[PDB]
Write a protein that binds this ligand. Sequence first.
Ligand SMILES: *P(=O)(O)OP(=O)(O)OP(=O)(O)OC[C@H]1O[C@@H](N2CN(C)c3c2nc(N)[nH]c3=O)[C@H](O)[C@@H]1O
Ligand SMILES: Nc1ncnc2c1ncn2[C@@H]1O[C@H](CSCC[C@H](N)C(=O)O)[C@@H](O)[C@H]1O
Length: 289
Amino acid sequence: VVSLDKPFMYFEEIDNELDYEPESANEVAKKLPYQGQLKLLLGELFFLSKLQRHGILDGATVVYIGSAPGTHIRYLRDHFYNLGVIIKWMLIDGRHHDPILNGLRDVTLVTRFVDEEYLRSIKKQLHPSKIILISDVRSPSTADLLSNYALQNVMISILNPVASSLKWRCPFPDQWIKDFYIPHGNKMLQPFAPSYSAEMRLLSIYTGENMRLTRVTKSDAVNYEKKMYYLNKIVRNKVVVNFDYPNQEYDYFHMYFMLRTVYCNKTFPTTKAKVLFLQQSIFRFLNIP
RNA sequence: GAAAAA
Ligand SMILES: *P(=O)(O)OP(=O)(O)OP(=O)(O)OC[C@H]1O[C@@H](N2CN(C)c3c2nc(N)[nH]c3=O)[C@H](O)[C@@H]1O
Ligand SMILES: Nc1ncnc2c1ncn2[C@@H]1O[C@H](CSCC[C@H](N)C(=O)O)[C@@H](O)[C@H]1O
């Protein structure tokens, strides 16, 4: 057990490190059904609420590349829809999207794997709409990663979004090829990720027609492995005794801090009240008990 | 990276 004031929201805040134990991969990584779908929903709800909070979400077109099956996206769509927000969703991916996204007047399902030219095409057919970028592409070896990151960067250059959420999982230091550059932004830690995932999300709001790239070296690669391992093995594997809530596991503690930033069209007397409600609807919708 | 029942 443990007593915590608040969970580690952004990577930079992970106070300790632990050298990766390869035996870890032999442990079960998914404890509940549709864990990934849940993990995606919370991060997106969270980022998209920071957007709502800034007044960047209404009238925007959310381009989610690498969106299949996207089961959780229908919940996101209904959410802001019921909130009164105007959003236009364009889901592009070569894999088939969940049937519950069909015929939705405000979502565009596009079956196709994205590339440079197709970015110019969607940018074209979208402008002057304010684009919000969400990537989740994954071709997995470092080569694949570096490739996906080369695309994620040009997605920003071509699409020129006003804000973006990228998939960010640094190459393990033992399979390193070379150094690369990534956009600058807040590295958001996500709950309900696989037990020993090193994946976090790079959230960034653009000043306008801007960006900024930062270098990543093998030394950085080692720091990630160290910090992330510690977070997964220790921190996440704990029960927060000072967390007044049915489930007191770290991930739920962390989700309570994510879920409390999201807006709802109904009135709630307390944060825990709203949190209980949102978690309920999400879990029931996703069929997670 | 995602991955109910069957
Ligand atoms: P996601 O983005 O978290 O998932 P992905 O499938 O890309 O990678 P993951 O399962 O984490 O890793 C695949 C294999 O690589 C070794 N791992 C995992 N892991 C967290 C980790 C590994 N190796 C080193 N050096 N350091 C790490 O931090 C295992 O063989 C996994 O099976
Ligand atoms: N160049 C590319 N363009 C678009 N999607 C791509 C891509 N390369 C890989 N992908 C897609 O990226 C996805 C990674 S997993 C995505 C899970 C999805 N976001 C969810 O909500 O369920 C895969 O479905 C893969 O088909």
